[PDB]
Design an enzyme around this catalytic site. Structure first.
Site, PDB file in Angstrom:
ATOM      1  N   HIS A  88       0.804  -1.212   0.000  1.00 31.47           N
ATOM      2  CA  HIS A  88       0.000   0.000   0.000  1.00 31.47           C
ATOM      3  C   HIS A  88       0.835   1.259   0.000  1.00 31.47           C
ATOM      4  O   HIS A  88       2.053   1.231   0.214  1.00 31.47           O
ATOM      5  CB  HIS A  88      -0.875  -0.012   1.229  1.00 31.47           C
ATOM      6  CG  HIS A  88      -1.740  -1.225   1.331  1.00 31.47           C
ATOM      7  ND1 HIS A  88      -2.935  -1.337   0.669  1.00 31.47           N
ATOM      8  CD2 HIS A  88      -1.653  -2.330   2.121  1.00 31.47           C
ATOM      9  CE1 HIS A  88      -3.475  -2.521   0.915  1.00 31.47           C
ATOM     10  NE2 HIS A  88      -2.736  -3.130   1.828  1.00 31.47           N
ATOM     11  N   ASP A  91      -1.667   8.768  -1.198  1.00 32.87           N
ATOM     12  CA  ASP A  91      -1.655   9.942  -2.025  1.00 32.87           C
ATOM     13  C   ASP A  91      -2.615  10.958  -1.372  1.00 32.87           C
ATOM     14  O   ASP A  91      -3.757  10.672  -1.165  1.00 32.87           O
ATOM     15  CB  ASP A  91      -2.062   9.536  -3.445  1.00 32.87           C
ATOM     16  CG  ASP A  91      -2.365  10.736  -4.407  1.00 32.87           C
ATOM     17  OD1 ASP A  91      -2.553  11.921  -4.051  1.00 32.87           O
ATOM     18  OD2 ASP A  91      -2.521  10.410  -5.601  1.00 32.87           O
ATOM     19  N   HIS A  93      -4.411  14.455  -1.936  1.00 33.47           N
ATOM     20  CA  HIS A  93      -4.696  15.525  -2.893  1.00 33.47           C
ATOM     21  C   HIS A  93      -4.368  16.906  -2.358  1.00 33.47           C
ATOM     22  O   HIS A  93      -4.336  17.812  -3.123  1.00 33.47           O
ATOM     23  CB  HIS A  93      -6.150  15.528  -3.290  1.00 33.47           C
ATOM     24  CG  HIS A  93      -6.538  14.378  -4.142  1.00 33.47           C
ATOM     25  ND1 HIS A  93      -7.788  14.296  -4.706  1.00 33.47           N
ATOM     26  CD2 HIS A  93      -5.864  13.265  -4.539  1.00 33.47           C
ATOM     27  CE1 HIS A  93      -7.881  13.155  -5.378  1.00 33.47           C
ATOM     28  NE2 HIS A  93      -6.697  12.565  -5.382  1.00 33.47           N
ATOM     29  N   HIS A 128      -6.071   8.881  -0.679  1.00 36.42           N
ATOM     30  CA  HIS A 128      -6.361   7.502  -1.011  1.00 36.42           C
ATOM     31  C   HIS A 128      -5.104   6.746  -1.337  1.00 36.42           C
ATOM     32  O   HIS A 128      -4.099   7.343  -1.690  1.00 36.42           O
ATOM     33  CB  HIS A 128      -7.371   7.395  -2.183  1.00 36.42           C
ATOM     34  CG  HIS A 128      -6.905   8.016  -3.488  1.00 36.42           C
ATOM     35  ND1 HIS A 128      -6.071   7.361  -4.385  1.00 36.42           N
ATOM     36  CD2 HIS A 128      -7.140   9.238  -4.032  1.00 36.42           C
ATOM     37  CE1 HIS A 128      -5.826   8.156  -5.423  1.00 36.42           C
ATOM     38  NE2 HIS A 128      -6.441   9.311  -5.216  1.00 36.42           N
ATOM     39  N   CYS A 129      -5.210   5.423  -1.237  1.00 33.96           N
ATOM     40  CA  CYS A 129      -4.160   4.519  -1.636  1.00 33.96           C
ATOM     41  C   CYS A 129      -4.034   4.523  -3.142  1.00 33.96           C
ATOM     42  O   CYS A 129      -5.020   4.721  -3.846  1.00 33.96           O
ATOM     43  CB  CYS A 129      -4.461   3.135  -1.100  1.00 33.96           C
ATOM     44  SG  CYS A 129      -3.130   1.987  -1.414  1.00 33.96           S
ATOM     45  N   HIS A 138      -7.625  -0.803  -5.048  1.00 28.33           N
ATOM     46  CA  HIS A 138      -7.438  -0.320  -3.677  1.00 28.33           C
ATOM     47  C   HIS A 138      -8.498   0.701  -3.241  1.00 28.33           C
ATOM     48  O   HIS A 138      -9.094   0.567  -2.166  1.00 28.33           O
ATOM     49  CB  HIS A 138      -5.994   0.169  -3.424  1.00 28.33           C
ATOM     50  CG  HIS A 138      -5.015  -0.968  -3.309  1.00 28.33           C
ATOM     51  ND1 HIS A 138      -4.162  -1.132  -2.226  1.00 28.33           N
ATOM     52  CD2 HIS A 138      -4.723  -1.967  -4.179  1.00 28.33           C
ATOM     53  CE1 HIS A 138      -3.490  -2.261  -2.383  1.00 28.33           C
ATOM     54  NE2 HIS A 138      -3.801  -2.786  -3.560  1.00 28.33           N
ATOM     55  N   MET A 143     -10.071   2.117   0.479  1.00 27.68           N
ATOM     56  CA  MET A 143      -8.851   2.696   0.966  1.00 27.68           C
ATOM     57  C   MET A 143      -8.776   4.187   0.616  1.00 27.68           C
ATOM     58  O   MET A 143      -8.012   4.593  -0.228  1.00 27.68           O
ATOM     59  CB  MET A 143      -7.660   1.906   0.431  1.00 27.68           C
ATOM     60  CG  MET A 143      -6.541   1.901   1.423  1.00 27.68           C
ATOM     61  SD  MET A 143      -5.372   0.528   1.236  1.00 27.68           S
ATOM     62  CE  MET A 143      -4.363   1.082   2.594  1.00 27.68           C
ATOM     63  N   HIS A 248     -27.895  15.579  -0.758  1.00 24.78           N
ATOM     64  CA  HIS A 248     -29.104  16.296  -0.512  1.00 24.78           C
ATOM     65  C   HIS A 248     -29.569  15.959   0.914  1.00 24.78           C
ATOM     66  O   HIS A 248     -29.715  14.804   1.271  1.00 24.78           O
ATOM     67  CB  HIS A 248     -30.164  15.885  -1.545  1.00 24.78           C
ATOM     68  CG  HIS A 248     -31.474  16.536  -1.317  1.00 24.78           C
ATOM     69  ND1 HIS A 248     -31.830  17.709  -1.929  1.00 24.78           N
ATOM     70  CD2 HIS A 248     -32.507  16.205  -0.502  1.00 24.78           C
ATOM     71  CE1 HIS A 248     -33.023  18.084  -1.487  1.00 24.78           C
ATOM     72  NE2 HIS A 248     -33.460  17.193  -0.620  1.00 24.78           N
ATOM     73  N   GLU A 272     -30.209  23.059  -2.969  1.00 17.18           N
ATOM     74  CA  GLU A 272     -31.053  21.883  -2.685  1.00 17.18           C
ATOM     75  C   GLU A 272     -30.191  20.611  -2.768  1.00 17.18           C
ATOM     76  O   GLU A 272     -30.248  19.731  -1.927  1.00 17.18           O
ATOM     77  CB  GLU A 272     -32.296  21.839  -3.577  1.00 17.18           C
ATOM     78  CG  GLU A 272     -32.083  21.448  -4.997  1.00 17.18           C
ATOM     79  CD  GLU A 272     -33.310  21.684  -5.898  1.00 17.18           C
ATOM     80  OE1 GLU A 272     -34.341  21.001  -5.692  1.00 17.18           O
ATOM     81  OE2 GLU A 272     -33.154  22.431  -6.909  1.00 17.18           O
ATOM     82  N   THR A 273     -29.371  20.554  -3.795  1.00 22.94           N
ATOM     83  CA  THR A 273     -28.545  19.399  -4.114  1.00 22.94           C
ATOM     84  C   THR A 273     -27.290  19.967  -4.764  1.00 22.94           C
ATOM     85  O   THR A 273     -27.375  21.039  -5.393  1.00 22.94           O
ATOM     86  CB  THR A 273     -29.322  18.477  -5.063  1.00 22.94           C
ATOM     87  OG1 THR A 273     -30.548  18.043  -4.412  1.00 22.94           O
ATOM     88  CG2 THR A 273     -28.487  17.286  -5.507  1.00 22.94           C
ATOM     89  N   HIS A 299     -28.704  12.065  -4.229  1.00 20.72           N
ATOM     90  CA  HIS A 299     -30.015  12.228  -4.893  1.00 20.72           C
ATOM     91  C   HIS A 299     -30.128  11.647  -6.335  1.00 20.72           C
ATOM     92  O   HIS A 299     -30.964  12.063  -7.110  1.00 20.72           O
ATOM     93  CB  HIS A 299     -30.505  13.699  -4.845  1.00 20.72           C
ATOM     94  CG  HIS A 299     -32.004  13.864  -4.815  1.00 20.72           C
ATOM     95  ND1 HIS A 299     -32.820  13.532  -5.885  1.00 20.72           N
ATOM     96  CD2 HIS A 299     -32.838  14.310  -3.831  1.00 20.72           C
ATOM     97  CE1 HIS A 299     -34.076  13.826  -5.570  1.00 20.72           C
ATOM     98  NE2 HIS A 299     -34.120  14.266  -4.326  1.00 20.72           N
TER      99      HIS A 299
HETATM  100  O1  LIG Z   1      -4.512  11.277  -6.738  1.00 20.22           O
HETATM  101  N1  LIG Z   1      -4.434  10.528  -7.704  1.00 20.22           N
HETATM  102  O2  LIG Z   1      -5.524   9.760  -8.101  1.00 20.22           O
HETATM  103  O1  LIG Z   2     -36.201  15.070  -1.279  1.00 15.76           O
HETATM  104  N1  LIG Z   2     -35.847  13.928  -1.010  1.00 15.76           N
HETATM  105  O2  LIG Z   2     -35.394  13.068  -2.007  1.00 15.76           O
HETATM  106 CU   LIG Z   3      -3.840   0.033  -0.597  1.00 15.32          CU
HETATM  107 CU   LIG Z   4      -6.399  10.877  -6.521  1.00 17.97          CU
HETATM  108 CU   LIG Z   5     -35.678  14.847  -3.135  1.00 21.17          CU
END
Ligand SMILES: O=N[O-]
Ligand SMILES: O=N[O-]
Ligand SMILES: [Cu+2]
Ligand SMILES: [Cu+2]
Ligand SMILES: [Cu+2]
Ligand SMILES: O=N[O-]
Ligand SMILES: O=N[O-]
Ligand SMILES: O=N[O-]
Ligand SMILES: O=N[O-]
Ligand SMILES: O=N[O-]
Ligand SMILES: O=N[O-]
Ligand SMILES: O=N[O-]
Ligand SMILES: O=N[O-]
Ligand SMILES: O=N[O-]
Ligand SMILES: O=N[O-]
Ligand SMILES: O=N[O-]
Ligand SMILES: O=N[O-]
Ligand SMILES: O=N[O-]
Ligand SMILES: O=N[O-]
Ligand SMILES: O=N[O-]
Ligand SMILES: O=N[O-]
Ligand SMILES: [Cu+2]
Ligand SMILES: [Cu+2]
Ligand SMILES: [Cu+2]
Lengths: 332, 332, 332
Positions: A88, A91, A93, A128-129, A138, A143, A248, A272-273, A299
């Site tokens: 493993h 990384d 970001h 993440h891995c 992974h 991960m 949401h 809303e979303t 949603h």
């Molecule tokens: O952060 N590299 O997928």
């Molecule tokens: O607004 N609920 O999906």
């Molecule tokens: Cu891994």
């Molecule tokens: Cu990445």
């Molecule tokens: Cu909804």
């Protein structure tokens, strides 16, 4: 000169909770030390008893949320115990260079490594891995996690006034691709390595079999529902390391949202979303105004209610009839 | 009165490179002349030798990036030689009217046409083929590219200060839908027209078989990696004519991103990953701070590392230990 | 004290048209009364004669657009006649509390209910049916619509100057998942309840069989095309209750877009294509500058031209050669 900076050791907590931290920085820049231990473990992910071989940071899916301030140094000790079977790495970001630290942190079972990086950009970020040749396997085995780099003076609204949260939760959303036999039954494997070629074929369909919050269907329900009170200001950090999601809050809104999670940008208001692209972490701030059960979902409602991407808040306090009321209850 | 405007003829270059241009306009408005020749050709798209009948502008997938300034006129001579078999046209998302020019540019094999339009809106924009009744087939066979319309005074940051790039690359991302037999082997066809009904069925799955940068798995690797130096300011234009993507620079960030590619809007800052919706071009500006190999991916990591959406930068210069360092290298 | 507020009764109209309203509020806050009757009905959704059992608000897919102003009260009388077979409810994303009203509006066939809520946040918002345990089935059978809450002083541009629309249309985009037999033929059912388990299996593929505007392939074409004139300012409200879409006006732009539909935010300018996440409504403002046929599509062009997500505008007036012209018409 880093040797003159204070060092602070942080003990991480299990998601969806978050370790204690200050919003507004109460010290100058520090080196913040974290330890994580990689655990490969069997996980039951749904009500039917489907099992996968999960690959985790610190035993959980997602990995724990790390919290620092802009221009702190993060120093991570990453342990891969000899009870694991796979190589493993990590990384971030949030980091600059060496594939986000991936190139410097490759650890076989029985090895450890310590990486340091400077947190130069404020926001929530995925980690993440990402081992060469096996990156998606992974990540989609669980991960991944997130790191929040707060501005030194805390969060701000679209006018630059302070926004202060009373509570903070971390929702990691995970796409799983469980291999199926010819009839559509999920397969089982003694070890992670056994699953490899079936895992690749399942992934190439681009169709997840399960999409879950905090590692299992129904993980954020019942006694594990998120809680708040009327009038509380809640920050919800949400990550998806591989596939787009659209959070949401059912019965609420995102008052202030950083959908792509980077706090130098003004937030979007009254959402809303919102869309969090795969490989991103986002954050939503909401002040609760009504008591009761709320559902927090992806949603795409199929992904939410059939595939598992739904959790609950339980909110206590006073009902406000001005906001909403039943004028005539359901009747013949 | 267009006859009084200067005319300049531009020779286009193969992606991911971009023809020479000025960022800040050094002349008044011009008519900028471009020629493109449509080529239908066999393309090998992966390491296994899978072949498709690609439909291209100027022999490449993507088509070449065209660069003009706001309120220039674009005059395109589009040639469909009689060695092709299909009818083609062109639709510019930068243009106003007539289906983006699609209604005026229908050319059978053996024909040519010249279209002119005024570039009234600054940004990066998709162009693509769009013949009536066969639109997605043409586009997903590779018949798309982009056009950048720069503001006359160049690019600006979120405060309105100049942003100047030292280098510019164009990444066209292409979703392909290669038809499969019953067992899952890719089919082959002598001509493009043979594939038509199998192509429609493959497309209707909404599941691409390959997603690539610059026309092939591994096209932007090895000796074809993108290059830069520490301290250089790089603009990466990224288009997807049909399906959403979420670019990410592994080991870096988007310092300034126009995710939907329209420069009258302020950029988003400090992005880890951004969403370019299908039918859009976007642009990301980054200053390199560390040497080494970087990977530029679609951060649906399955689409990146299994389906082909990954390329490399190779960056030269000095390592900065303050930003990142290995404190304890991997050890037992 | 709500009893002292004026009451106004609004009669709703069929999409894509919108009931009469004022942009700038000509009165103080009001209680705005709406009635909707739930209709379960057979719908033919494509040129082949494929039929589904649609679940609708007021007989249409989408449900009708409701229009109020910020800080009005919405009072909805929801009728479920005894000719229906299923339990329904309504969730407004515009509302605060009780699952957006879902918890208070559960109506068996033969029942009615009246809900009131205060419209505290300006924007376009989705509403949809959401009965416990059957949420995606209801939504993807067509049981969704939108509500627009205008600021009391109308819409504003990115500088805060008034934007006034001459016309407004509502485009509801619907993902359908029609169950298929072994060979890929669509199945038929006498009643909605018959389809339940096949519907769940079809949904879990995450692959829609049809994606349509206003309830059918080709619904917004021919004599049902949207109309405008050169120089008119048109607002297009677009909702998708379950799955992401990426609208695009072929031959035009979004001059001002609120992609996630919330008017306290500045609009994005000069968009070619924008992403409306599933569970969101968005709005795009465009001034027509050229006459002719325009196509309005989801710019996943497979979803548009194979699965049904395409409609037409027919625009009258004068052609402007300065914007676009054919210099040399297609010729040998
Ligand atoms: O952060 N590299 O997928
Ligand atoms: O607004 N609920 O999906
Ligand atoms: Cu891994
Ligand atoms: Cu990445
Ligand atoms: Cu909804
Ligand atoms: O139990 N380890 O996969
Ligand atoms: O697993 N090494 O400490
Ligand atoms: O990356 N899938 O939304
Ligand atoms: O397709 N992304 O949820
Ligand atoms: O990425 N900014 O929310
Ligand atoms: O070689 N032409 O498809
Ligand atoms: O192919 N006509 O010039
Ligand atoms: O349009 N597909 O992301
Ligand atoms: O699903 N779009 O990559
Ligand atoms: O589309 N503006 O980045
Ligand atoms: O005709 N009712 O489904
Ligand atoms: O259907 N009850 O009025
Ligand atoms: O939620 N599907 O884009
Ligand atoms: O994948 N959403 O169109
Ligand atoms: O630009 N029309 O897809
Ligand atoms: O959601 N604001 O467009
Ligand atoms: Cu073509
Ligand atoms: Cu287009
Ligand atoms: Cu219903």
């Amino acid at each position: 000169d880093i040797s003159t900076l204070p060092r602070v050791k942080v003990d991480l907590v299990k998601p969806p909770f978050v370790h204690a931290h200050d919003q507004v920085a109460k010290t100058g820049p520090r080196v913040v030390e974290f330890t994580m231990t990689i655990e490969e473990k069997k996980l039951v992910i749904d009500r039917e008893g489907t099992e996968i071989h999960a690959m985790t940071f610190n035993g959980s899916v997602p990995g724990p949320l790390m919290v620092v301030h802009e221009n702190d140094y993060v120093e991570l000790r990453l342990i891969n115990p000899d009870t694991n079977t796979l190589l493993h790495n990590i990384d971030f970001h949030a980091a600059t260079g060496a594939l986000g630290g991936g190139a410097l942190t490759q650890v076989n079972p029985g090895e450890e490594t310590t990486l340091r990086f400077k947190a130069t950009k404020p926001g929530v970020f995925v980690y993440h891995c990402a081992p060469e040749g096996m990156v998606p396997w992974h990540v989609t085995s669980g991960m991944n996690g997130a790191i929040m780099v707060l501005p030194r003076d805390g969060l701000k609204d679209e006018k630059g006034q302070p926004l202060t949260y009373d509570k903070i939760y971390y929702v990691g959303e995970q796409d799983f691709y469980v291999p199926k036999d010819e009839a559509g039954n999920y397969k089982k494997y003694e070890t992670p390595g056994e699953a490899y070629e079936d895992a690749v074929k399942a992934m190439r369909t681009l169709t997840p079999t399960h999409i879950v919050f905090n590692g299992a269907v129904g993980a954020l329900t019942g006694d594990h529902a998120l809680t708040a009170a009327v009038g509380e200001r809640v920050l919800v950090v949400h990550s998806q390391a591989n596939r787009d999601t659209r959070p949401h809050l059912i019965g609420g809104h995102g008052d202030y949202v950083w959908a792509t999670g980077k706090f130098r940008n003004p937030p979007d208001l009254d959402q809303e979303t919102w869309l969090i692209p795969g490989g991103t972490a986002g954050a939503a701030f909401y002040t609760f105004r009504q008591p009761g059960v709320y559902a927090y979902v992806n949603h795409n409602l199929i992904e939410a209610f059939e595939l598992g991407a739904a959790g609950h808040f339980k909110v206590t306090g006073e009902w406000n009839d001005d906001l909403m009321t039943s004028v005539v209850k359901p009747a013949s």
